[PDB]
A paper describes a structure:
A key group of these are the respiratory chain supercomplexes (SCs); these which primarily consist of complexes I, III2 and IV (CI, CIII2 and CIV) in varying stoichiometries, which serve as the minimal functional units for NADH:O2 oxidoreduction. Our structures, with an average resolution of approximately 2.5 Å and local resolution up to 1.8 Å in the best regions, enable in-depth study of mitochondrial respiratory SCs in their native states.
To investigate the effects of varying levels of ischaemia on the atomic-level structure of CI in native mitochondria, we exposed porcine hearts to room temperature for durations of 0 min (‘fresh’), 40 min (‘mild’) and more than 4 h (‘harsh’) before mitochondrial isolation. The active and deactive states of CI are delineated by distinct structural hallmarks, including domain movements and conformational alterations around the Q-binding site and in proximal membrane-domain subunits. We built the models in these states and compared them with the canonical active and deactive structures. The closed structure, characterized by a reduced angle and tight interactions between the transmembrane and hydrophilic arms, corresponds to the active resting state, whereas the open structure is indicative of the deactive resting state. Consistently, our study also identified two main classes of CI, namely the active and deactive states, characterized by the closed and open conformations. In the fresh sample, approximately 75% of CI in SCs adopted an active state, compared with around 30% and 18% under mild and harsh conditions, respectively. In the fresh-condition batch, the active state predominated, with an increase in deactive states upon incubation at room temperature, indicating that the deactive state may arise with gradual depletion of substrates.
Residue numbers in the entry:
A (entry chain 1b): 1 to 83
B (entry chain 1X): 1 to 114
C (entry chain 1J): 1 to 175
D (entry chain 1Z): 49 to 144
E (entry chain 1D): 28 to 37, 73
F (entry chain 1A): 1 to 25, 53 to 115
G (entry chain 1H): 1 to 193, 219 to 318
H (entry chain 1e): 1 to 99
The structure:
Amino acid sequence: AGRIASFLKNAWAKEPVLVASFAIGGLAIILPSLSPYTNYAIRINRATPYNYPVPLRDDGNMPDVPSHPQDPQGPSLEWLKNL
Amino acid sequence: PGIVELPTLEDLKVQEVKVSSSVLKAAAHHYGAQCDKPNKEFMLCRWEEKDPRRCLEEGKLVNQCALDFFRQIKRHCAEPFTEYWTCIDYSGLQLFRHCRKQQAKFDECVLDKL
Amino acid sequence: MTMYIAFILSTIFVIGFVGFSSKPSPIYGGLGLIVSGGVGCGIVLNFGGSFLGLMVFLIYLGGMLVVFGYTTAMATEMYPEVWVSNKTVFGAFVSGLMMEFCMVYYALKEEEVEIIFKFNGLGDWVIYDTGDSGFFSEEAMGIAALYSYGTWLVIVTGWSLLIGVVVIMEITRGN
Amino acid sequence: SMMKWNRERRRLQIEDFEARIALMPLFQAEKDRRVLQMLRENLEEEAIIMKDVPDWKVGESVFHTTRWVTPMMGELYGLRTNEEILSATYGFIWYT
Amino acid sequence: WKPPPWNDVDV
Amino acid sequence: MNIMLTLLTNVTLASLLVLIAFWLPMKFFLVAITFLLFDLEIALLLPLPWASQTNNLKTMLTMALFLLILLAASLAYEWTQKGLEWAE
Amino acid sequence: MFMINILSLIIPILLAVAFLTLVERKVLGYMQLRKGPNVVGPYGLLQPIADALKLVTKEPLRPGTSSISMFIIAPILGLSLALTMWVPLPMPYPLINMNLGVLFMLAMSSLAVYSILWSGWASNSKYALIGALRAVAQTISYEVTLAIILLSVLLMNGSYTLSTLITTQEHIWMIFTSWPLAMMWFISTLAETPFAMFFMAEYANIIMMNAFTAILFLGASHDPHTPELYTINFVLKTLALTITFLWIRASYPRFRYDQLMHLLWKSFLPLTLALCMWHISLPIMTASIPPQS
Amino acid sequence: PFFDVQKRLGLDLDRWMTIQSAEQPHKIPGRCHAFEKEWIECAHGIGGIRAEKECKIEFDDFVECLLRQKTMKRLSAIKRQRDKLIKEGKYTPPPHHLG
Amino acid sequence: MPLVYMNIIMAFAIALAGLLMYRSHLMSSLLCLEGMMLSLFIMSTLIILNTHFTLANMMPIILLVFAACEAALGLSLLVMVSNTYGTDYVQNLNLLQC
Amino acid sequence: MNPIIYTTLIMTVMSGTMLVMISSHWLLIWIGFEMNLLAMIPVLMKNFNPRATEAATKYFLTQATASMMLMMAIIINLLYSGQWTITKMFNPVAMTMMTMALAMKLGLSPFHFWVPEVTQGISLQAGLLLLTWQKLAPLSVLCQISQSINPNLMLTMAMLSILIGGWGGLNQTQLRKIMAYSSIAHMGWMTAVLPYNTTMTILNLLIYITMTLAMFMLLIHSSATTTLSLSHTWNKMPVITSLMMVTLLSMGGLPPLSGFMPKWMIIQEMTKNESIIMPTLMAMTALLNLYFYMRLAYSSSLTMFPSTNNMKMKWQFEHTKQMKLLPTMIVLSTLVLPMTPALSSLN
Amino acid sequence: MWFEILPGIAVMAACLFIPGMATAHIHKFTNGGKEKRVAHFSYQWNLMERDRCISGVNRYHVTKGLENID
Ligand SMILES: CCCCCCCCCCCCCCCCCC(=O)OC[C@H](COP(=O)([O-])OCC[N+](C)(C)C)OC(=O)CCCCCCCCCCCCCCCCC
Ligand SMILES: CCCCCCCCCCCCCCCCCC(=O)OC[C@H](COP(=O)(O)OCCN)OC(=O)CCCCCCCCCCCCCCCCC
């Protein structure tokens, strides 16, 4: 209490620069694993299709994959639409 | 050390689609929707067979359906096609951003006409 | 023919090296090296090495070689020497030209000389492929994977750089 | 403001990519025919130019395996106008 | 030749 | 074709201007090394804009932060042990 | 006609390099109750012609102990550089839309240190040797702040393609997201910047630095059809910056070297690192990573 | 490695980049990916002594793809006779060759 | 193997020979040092780009960033040997006769 | 050097060497050698005397030259095979190119002129590091590529090293020069058997290593830098010279003193490979190392030498160093001949 | 008076303005209407080469829409 408050007062009086850079780096390296958006960031990164989605040989029992890009099956990008 | 088999010129004759890139990109979205099966089976040949010579007839089909896809849009609202792709072609990046009203003037046919 | 871009930059690279390898003045050696570094970018750029090429222009040209100019200026020998000061410098200069003359002329005539390796070789434009990079720059994705696939190369590279700092100050400390 | 605009660009990019994906297969067929057409023309010229040679029968497989090696840029065009080689080889790299 | 020094020290 | 053409004419006008101009009428080395070591660290963290679009972004954030933490440590060390302070 | 476009850039920039000097002297003049050049032509309009042709008629004396080869190629590079980084500027549509324009700008602008380094060495004088040594260390100190600022700026842009900068800003000036960096960037630009040449070399650097700062932080809206909108906005923004660049020329005592290094390595570099750390995670923080393509 | 510590703890330190047919970013393939895949798959669990001789054509074809040596000289002798044949007017290029 | 590929290779050989014999100057010796890595950086760059080794493009930049650790240590040794002996002349490095 | 700085400095030298022994990628190998050089120089530049600056400059120039010469050899291997693994290289030019680069960093062939001088200028304690720990990583790589090594080149490297190792040591008086020339001769001994058997190279490594610290750290405890200065050790520390003499006898390779174990097994392994002129020549010239070994042994313990009046002062005080690992190093380097079948452990 | 600066700044403002206007106008001219298509990736470039090939006059900016196909 007494030591830390004086120390920050000791720091922030003579120099504001390093305490500013230490603070800005402090949030910049802590906050990564706090907000529920880094999961969003990697999801839209995975969403962006660079290479072609090469089709699979249909032989029955894969209801997951669709038979047409208009089919409801497969991944839905609507989560990013409101994002 | 082996014959490099190459199909003759006669088999290499398709009704090549004579359209620019901008017109291709303008109708690309509806192209993929209504003509997936030709393309889908052709590139499955390209990835399964992994040989250009093994996939020729499917190469015929994709272009043929492209012409079959490029005929009705001539028959129905060719003029809205012109205005859309003549504004798409202006953009150096073919930016879809500065083409919205003309895009709307395109798909409202195919919504009700096609 | 702009087809000469094949060999023109590469042969200038050789004469750039002979310029400073023959030990001219350290300022002049810097001039010879940066010239070779300058044209060396052209070969990489003509191969698609925009990012890698410009980095040579950044750290090798605007970095590494500048600090050499700093050290050489600090040395400031009472009598700086010139490319004509020693005939050995000229003798090596004519020599280095002669070997590259032999290689180039042998290359352009018989195309099948046998120095060290098999040599051979037409204009370089062949070795390129006929594929496409799609929408991703193949080079940019390669180096962007430094933080994705190379999370061990980074540690040893980073650790040595910090250790590079500690050694530099340790031996220049002067006690 | 940058947060909202950047996501808008990402939605724009994937739509642009969607156009490229939906439109890629036509060029794959088109590039497929082009290289095979260019190869067939090269071999046809080979069957006109080179007879006096002792044993250089046309269409020898340089690679032992019977696969399809992707044609390297040299023998693809090769016997064409030097402008064609310059435009095909450097091209994109020089277009700026 | 001479033997080395014993301690190795040579505005 | 286009690039060196722009370079060629640029120096040529530089050439014609100067030609008619002269025809018509330890501390310094120390930081220079630290700049060198810092500059090479700069090149390591240059490809970041493309690296921000990877699929393994979770391991990117720790790794990309690691350079800046470690690079700052070199500055912090260099500062503390006299060093980075302008020597005499 | 592409060659004509080069002359349609190099010469007017050369004239632009020539003609803001009268702006400088008259701004610097009217600032100190003075008038500036106003007797030679109307309001000094012909003052630049009054000095240039005089300079070319002045004999270029050469030091006896001067290496002629370096003494004449150092200005060659100095002018060649000063008129080369004007080529990839995304001014309406750039002459060269290099996908790595920012890197090219930095590598070739960091090459200017060779000209001053060679000038001091080739001159071979006690004044010239230290002055080259001081100038280069001041310069080579300041790309690390330059590079980090530009790197950390471009995380929220998308790539090094200078043309993409316009799309990134569009809605708001990019200063509103990185104004701590703008003052970080602007100050660093001040210090980084035969004898008849050396006027031209550093001077185009002065305007282009502000042109570079203009596109980077204070963007405009480039209407696809009418390009004049971006032309006027770009010129007006880079004029206001340059007036500010000379506004501070006669408003502060000049920096001293020990503070000059102390200011960067102890009060500019560590803060630049923090902002870079802030701007590397924030696109990830808010899932606002930009598209490169 | 002399001491395969990475084999024991099972973490990849330098095997991601040691060969060109690994998990490349965004699945951009190497130029000789197809040939390297055959050579590696042929020479697995065989040992250096046996695999160097047994899987020889795989290595030679992959080397030719990697270096572009033998088929390049095929092209070199293609142009060699061409310049030695059309110069004295023995044959003329067809229109598609001319452009 | 194309003509240019061994235009770098000889350049490395010339740079190696220049470093393998000293004329009078340690700075000039150092200049051939990172000249050798320049060709080494250059030579690797053609290989990786030509072969489409999509993941090996790492190697060039780290080849440069690690050759710098040699260079940075390199001159920093010379500044020591050129402040006791005063001159970077390498013939003054014979004090270790015995 | 602040001990925390020095400790971390040593730590990355070991890490740099350790990285070499555990890296499959060729590039990581060059990194480990690069880090090792990057931190070896400051350790040599710890005393900060002109000889140290001379030695560090020589060491850096030859090591950095071989480091990037090594890097060139890897690229040629990449140029001809597109590989990065350490299994067996695919280009004969690269085989010799890297063999030259690797060998120069060990100082055995004509690429050895730095070794006597670099250890001479630098301090004794840092010399122990140079001639023991900096000699595992290049040897580690060589064992891994022993399949593709060129016997004609490699054995010519071995013959010259042993010949120069004995001949050079005969004419030296500075005991640091004695150790380096002995080390070069030992290096030729181990380096001759890589084409035949890597395991025997390893055994020659540990025995030579333990022997060097045994000799070097005993020299540290005696605090001597010349043969004359070593002579006076008998008066102050008679015990030290007693074990130091038996270490010299073992260093020659006289049974049953261990140190004959590597030479014995090296001869036996080459003899199985129908190479019988080669073992004889190295064995015959191995006696050359014994001559200056006896010469050093003669004027340290066997015959007392004229001491000095001030030496009486040294008797009153006692050593402060705890001579860690000294005792078990002597025994492990002088009596382990009966425990030779431990060769199987290395395999 | 302070407004005498403007004649100084105006001419160089035109001197700075000309490079932008000239580049945009020549882009509209040499590309005939549509601006110079930008190819930052090999995909856009091979698109342009397809446009030049399909034009039949070796001019990429010549575009053949619905009137070309049958
Ligand atoms: C959620 C928020 C995240 C981000 C938060 C960021 C941190 C909070 C804000 C921090 C402060 C603002 C950003 C950094 C500014 C600089 C910091 C710094 O070191 O300042 C002290 C520095 C140094 O001051 P000093 O040297 O007296 O003291 C520094 C501290 N000690 C004593 C320990 C060294 O100030 C300067 O360098 C003075 C200016 C030098 C240049 C002279 C010309 C100035 C012209 C000014 C007018 C024009 C401005 C144009 C701006 C751009 C326009 C496009
Ligand atoms: C392989 C062939 C042989 C190779 C080795 C040969 C070794 C001898 C020759 C070495 C070469 C040089 C010539 C000799 C030089 C000797 C110099 C020397 O230091 O001599 C004097 C020295 C003084 O010793 P000091 O410190 O007084 O201690 C005496 C014991 N308290 O003297 C000493 O330090 C000697 C002290 C002797 C102590 C030995 C203790 C032995 C204990 C045995 C215990 C046995 C227990 C048995 C139990 C049985 C039931 C289990």
